[PDB]
Amino acid sequence: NIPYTQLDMAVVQNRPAGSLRRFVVLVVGETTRAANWGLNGYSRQTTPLLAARGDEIVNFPQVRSCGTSTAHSLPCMFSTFDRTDYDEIKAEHQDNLLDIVQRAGVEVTWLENDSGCKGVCGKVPNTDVTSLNLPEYCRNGECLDNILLTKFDEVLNKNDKDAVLILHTIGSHGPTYYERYTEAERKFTPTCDTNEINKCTRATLVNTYDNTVLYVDQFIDKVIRKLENRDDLESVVHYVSDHGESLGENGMYLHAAPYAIAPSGQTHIPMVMWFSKAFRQHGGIDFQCLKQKAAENEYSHDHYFSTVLGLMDISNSQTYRKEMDILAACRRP
């Protein structure tokens, strides 16, 4: 019974003349938390493939989520609203980040493997891959995230337009944490190989969760592998989780704790970025500047909206905020 507000009706892309195609992948993580992320100095190396890439990967050790649950964080991070002003009803009744990006002429595709896109993806091309139920990847109606990679090349090769591809993963979601990885990532043992996580010790729970992080690491790595040798493409891979998780600290499990009293495990989330050779050469970013800002500054889901607009060279936007675009402070005139 309330009015919908279309936003940013003037947007266009303003790519430099003669530009290469720009292809951006937004990996939307799930449940993975900052405190168990190798690149953040966690005592275990849960991110070996990203770590081995050294400064090719920009890591952000101080990032906070908008919510402690998926249905809160996803619409909030894709909305113009910052956490402190976010309102579910207001956000549902206006254009979101992807509606605006698509209007600007960018090819947006959403690939879903996490039980639903929470109303964010309906107006752009979207496919839920979980129903494929491939025996290689899937059991009990959930699938290992690598299933998303089976549909990646089709999006990459669809046409020559600049693109934003969202890969919405199941990541570290519990209580079936054991389903989130394979034998190749089962490095921390013993494990809790049941949904009844109360029947496991919290040490074995942490082990199992850390193995899920190894799978996140290899997933991001495989996405980078699809793009890093495409010298004719300016590609960016951005990863951020939706929220963290509690692993029995003070008797707290799972997530969705009320934001104000939520433990740091649920609000402090990992975020990384990777940039292709052509992007680094032509994209205008000062990478030493960026490395320093990533290390020193606190960021949040609030930065997501304008960072993504900035990655597509979207001009004539009223919703864009240069101060909330992570890269703008390091972007050359």
Binding-site residue positions for Cu(2+)? 1, 93
For 17-128, list the strands marked E by DSSP: 21-28, 57-59, 63-64, 107-112, 126-128
Judged by beta carbon, residue 26 or residue 163, the one nearer Zn ion is: 26
Which listed range, 67-75, 119-127, 297-305, 316-324, lies at the site for Zn ion (CB under 5 A)? 67-75
Instruction: Give ∠ CA 174-244-288 in degrees, rounded to 5.
Output: 135
Piece in contact with Zn ion (CB under 5 A), picked from 54-62, 66-74, 80-88, 231-239: 66-74
* CA atoms in the 13 A half-sphere facing the CB of 242: 26
Q: Using CA atoms, how far apart are residues 143 and 108, in angstroms rounded to an integer?
A: 23
CB of 3 to Zn ion, least distance (A): 9
46 part of the interface to Zn ion, by CB under 5 A: no
Contact region with Zn ion (CB under 5 A), list: 59-67, 94-102, 241-249, 314-322? 241-249
**Least distance to Zn ion, CB of residue 115, Å:** 8
Q: Which residues contact 80 (CB under 8 A, 6 or more apart)?
A: 7, 91, 94, 97, 305, 319
Q: Whose Cβ is closer to Zn ion: residue 8's or residue 30's?
A: 30
Find the binding residues for Zn ion in span 259-298 (CB under 5 A).
none
Of all residues in the shown chain, the one whose CB is closest to Zn ion is 70
Nearest CB to Zn ion, comparing residues 266 and 317: 266
- The pair of three-digit structure tokens given for residue 290, joined into one six-digit string: 């960026």
How far is residue 149 from each of residues 137, 178, 219, measured CA to CA in Å? 11, 21, 9
Residues 6+ apart with CB under 8 A from 189: 207
Q: Interface with Zn ion includes 145 (CB under 5 A)?
A: no
Binding site members for Mg(2+) = 76, 79, 81
The least CB distance from residue 161 to Zn ion, in Å, is 30
Calpha distance 119→115 (Å, rounded):
12
Q: How far is the CB of 173 from Zn ion (least distance, A)?
A: 6
Single out the residue of 170, 177, 175 nearest to residue 145, CA to CA.
Answer: 170
Ranges within 203-222 binding Zn ion (CB under 5 A):
none
Stretch of 63-71, 145-153, 195-203, 269-277 lying at the interface with Zn ion (CB under 5 A): 63-71
List the one residue from 242, 245, 313, 325 that touches Zn ion (CB under 5 A).
242
How far is 86 from 136, CA to CA, in rounded Å? 40
Return d(Cα 80, Cα 7) in angstroms, integer. Answer: 10
Secondary element (H or E) of residue 102: helix 97-103
Sequence-separated (6 or more) residues with CB below 8 Å from residue 18:
none
Cβ distance to Zn ion smaller for residue 30 or 302: 30
Kindly tell me which of 8 and 242 has the beta carbon lying closer to Zn ion.
242
Amino acid letter, 122: G
- Contacts (CB under 5 A) with Zn ion, residues 14-43: 30
Q: Is 70 in the site for Zn ion (CB under 5 A)?
A: yes
CB of 35 to Zn ion, least distance (A): 16
Nearer to Zn ion, 217 or 242 (CB): 242
CA distance 48 to 214: 8
Determine the Cα–Cα distance for residues 214 and 194; give it in Å rounded to an integer: 19
Q: Which residues are annotated as a binding site?
A: 1, 30, 70, 76, 79, 81, 93, 173, 242-243, 255
Q: How far is the CB of 5 from Zn ion (least distance, A)?
A: 12
Kindly list the residues in this chain that would bind Zn ion in the complex (CB under 5 A): 30, 70, 242
